[PDB]
Amino acid sequence: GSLTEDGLSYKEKFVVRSYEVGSNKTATVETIANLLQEVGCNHAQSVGFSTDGFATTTTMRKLHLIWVTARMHIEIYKYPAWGDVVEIETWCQSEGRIGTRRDWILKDSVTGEVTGRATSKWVMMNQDTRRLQKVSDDVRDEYLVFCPQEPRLAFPEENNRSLKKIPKLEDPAQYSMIGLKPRRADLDMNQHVNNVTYIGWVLESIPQEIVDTHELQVITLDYRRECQQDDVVDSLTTTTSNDSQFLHLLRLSGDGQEINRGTTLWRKK
Amino acid sequence: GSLTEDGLSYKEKFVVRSYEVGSNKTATVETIANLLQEVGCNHAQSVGFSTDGFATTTTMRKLHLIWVTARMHIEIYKYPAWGDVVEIETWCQSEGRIGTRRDWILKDSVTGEVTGRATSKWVMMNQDTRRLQKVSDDVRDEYLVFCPQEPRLAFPEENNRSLKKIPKLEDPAQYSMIGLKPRRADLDMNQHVNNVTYIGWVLESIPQEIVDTHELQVITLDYRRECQQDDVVDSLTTTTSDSQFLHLLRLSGDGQEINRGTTLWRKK
Ligand SMILES: CC(=O)N1CCN(c2ccc(Cl)cc2)CC1
Numbered sequence: 001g002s003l004t005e006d007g008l009s010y011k012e013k014f015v016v017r018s019y020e021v022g023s024n025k026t027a028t029v030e031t032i033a034n035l036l037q038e039v040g041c042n043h044a045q046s047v048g049f050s051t052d053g054f055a056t057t058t059t060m061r062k063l064h065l066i067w068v069t070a071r072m073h074i075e076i077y078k079y080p081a082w083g084d085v086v087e088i089e090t091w092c093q094s095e096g097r098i099g100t101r102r103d104w105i106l107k108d109s110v111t112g113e114v115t116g117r118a119t120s121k122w123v124m125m126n127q128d129t130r131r132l133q134k135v136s137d138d139v140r141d142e143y144l145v146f147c148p149q150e151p152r153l154a155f156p157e158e159n160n161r162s163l164k165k166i167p168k169l170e171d172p173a174q175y176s177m178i179g180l181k182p183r184r185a186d187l188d189m190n191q192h193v194n195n196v197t198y199i200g201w202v203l204e205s206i207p208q209e210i211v212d213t214h215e216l217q218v219i220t221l222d223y224r225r226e227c228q229q230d231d232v233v234d235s236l237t238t239t240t241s242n243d244s245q246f247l248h249l250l251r252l253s254g255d256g257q258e259i260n261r262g263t264t265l266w267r268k269k
Numbered sequence: 270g271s272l273t274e275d276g277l278s279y280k281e282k283f284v285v286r287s288y289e290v291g292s293n294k295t296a297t298v299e300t301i302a303n304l305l306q307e308v309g310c311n312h313a314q315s316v317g318f319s320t321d322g323f324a325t326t327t328t329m330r331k332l333h334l335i336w337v338t339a340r341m342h343i344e345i346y347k348y349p350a351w352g353d354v355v356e357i358e359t360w361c362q363s364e365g366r367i368g369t370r371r372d373w374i375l376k377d378s379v380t381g382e383v384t385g386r387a388t389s390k391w392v393m394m395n396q397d398t399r400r401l402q403k404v405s406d407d408v409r410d411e412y413l414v415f416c417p418q419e420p421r422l423a424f425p426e427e428n429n430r431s432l433k434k435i436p437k438l439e440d441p442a443q444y445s446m447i448g449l450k451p452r453r454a455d456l457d458m459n460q461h462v463n464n465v466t467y468i469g470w471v472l473e474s475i476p477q478e479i480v481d482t483h484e485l486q487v488i489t490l491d492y493r494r495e496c497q498q499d500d501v502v503d504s505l506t507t508t509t510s511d512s513q514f515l516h517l518l519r520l521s522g523d524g525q526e527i528n529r530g531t532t533l534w535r536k537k
């Protein structure tokens with residue numbers, strides 16, 4: 001991997017592994033999400049930011065401040081097959097008062113065609129209190145020199161899917177998968193549940209018949225609260241719709257405290 | 270990756286990824302196990318065998334025959350750190366009547382030192398009936414041309430840790446983690462639970478204090494029965510001692526055994 005010529009974005013190539021593919025012999029959306037996270041981590045390492053997933057500065061670290069994902073939106077046109085080389089380009093931009101954004105473009109290395117795209121919205125928060133806080137000018141100034149300042153969007157369209165408001169699923173859910181718990185492989189280096197695990201938990205309540213006869217085209221996920229190492233989660237799904245659409249909700253098994261909500265769009269094979 | 274000069278082994282390099290490391294910022298044993306499986310798959314692809322994990326021949330495929338792991342034994346001296354390059358060499362050998370074997374040597378790419386080693390025993394069986402079958406001479410002959418015929422062992426010590434018999438844990442277990450279920454990420458391309466998931470399930474019943482103050486040095490795991498997509502598993506552990514543990518994975522309901530194993534941990 002390497003920063004591009006203008007130093008305002010980062011590119012990396014990946015060969016799809018045997019354990020990274022699903023029933024179609026192509027990479028799963030969780031393998032894609034792991035790769036987006038990996039290239040974001042390598043971009044941070046390339047310019048001196050933390051490499052723990054929070055991409056902090058020394059100033060943020062002494063104030064116990066971190067960057068946290070508020071929303072992840074992924075759209076895949078073609079899932080790469082086992083042994084294929086996928087090239088991923090990533091960049092970040094400030095959105096002032098709303099927070100910050102990281103975008104990605106996935107391409108087939110052989111043809112150069114865009115096979116997928118993703119965007120994520122981030123907010124600054126105190127690590128201990130979990131209270132959101134506005135980024136100071138002195139912290140912001142350290143990041144702007146690594147971002148393009150002219151808008152560069154992976155999703156430029158007028159009222160695109162990445163910005164749509166997601167409603168809360170109402171009981172009873174059409175489908176459910178209960179008692180989901182994270183194991184040590186689901187945790188990052190700081191013992192937090194990896195964002196990719198929540199994607200897997202959302203998809204667990206999709207009926208296998210849909211998975212067998214459709215391909216996942218779009219996934220949007222809002223992150224409201226962290227699932228702790230010892231928490232148990234319920235995954236709820238209701239069909240909202242050639243295409244199938246679902247509304248999703250992840251909540252704690254006991255009190256029903258919401259941790260995530262999202263929507264998925266599937267296309268018939 | 271590539272076959273070596275003599276064509277009797279295969280080598281591949283891997284750079285450790287950010288999501289592949291544990292609290293020590295070094296690769297987990299599950300990341301190592303995934304890499305061993307990956308290099309075994311690439312070795313099969315490089316000489317025309319199936320690439321689904323069963324490394325079958327056309328003849329085996331028409332008879333519904335597969336190679337299945339009976340035992341996996343891994344010993345790690347140094348876990349590679351995030352961003353390090355690890356080189357893995359793998360080869361396979363026939364053990365006649367006992368079944369077959371795949372071995373691996375892990376090295377630090379920069380220094381060339383051996384950082385780990387692994388061995389696995391395989392048996393042939395019918396995929397539908399699950400009955401073990403003796404390998405025919407015509408099937409065996411297709412594989413021998415890709416194996417060294419002089420013994421080449423990752424664990425040569427006479428009656429070493431890789432060959433020790435594992436006893437069955439007796440109730441009550443000292444520690445337990447119950448109700449473990451596989452999700453779609455735990456399945457391979459043919460919807461079977463990946464062997465690496467069972468390693469993760471075994472380790473779930475190790476107390477976090479041990480994980481926090483020790484490094485896993487050796488793991489031996491016997492595979493008795495497959496956990497299906499809709500099965501629920503209980504993971505049991507009892508200290509037998511460095512720290513040593515006896516492990517047992519069984520179905521949550523009837524207590525049917527799926528795996529047994531032992532782990533050895535070294536104080537940090
Ligand atoms: C970990 C990660 O991908 N991100 C998204 C981009 N981030 C960012 C922060 C400040 C400014 Cl001015 C611009 C961008 C925060 C961290």
Ligand SMILES: CC(=O)N1CCN(c2ccc(Cl)cc2)CC1
Nearest residue numbers: 324336361362363369371412413
């Ligand atoms: C999947 C896997 O790792 N293996 C290695 C050992 N195998 C093998 C079979 C026959 C002979 Cl003669 C030698 C070796 C089966 C495939």
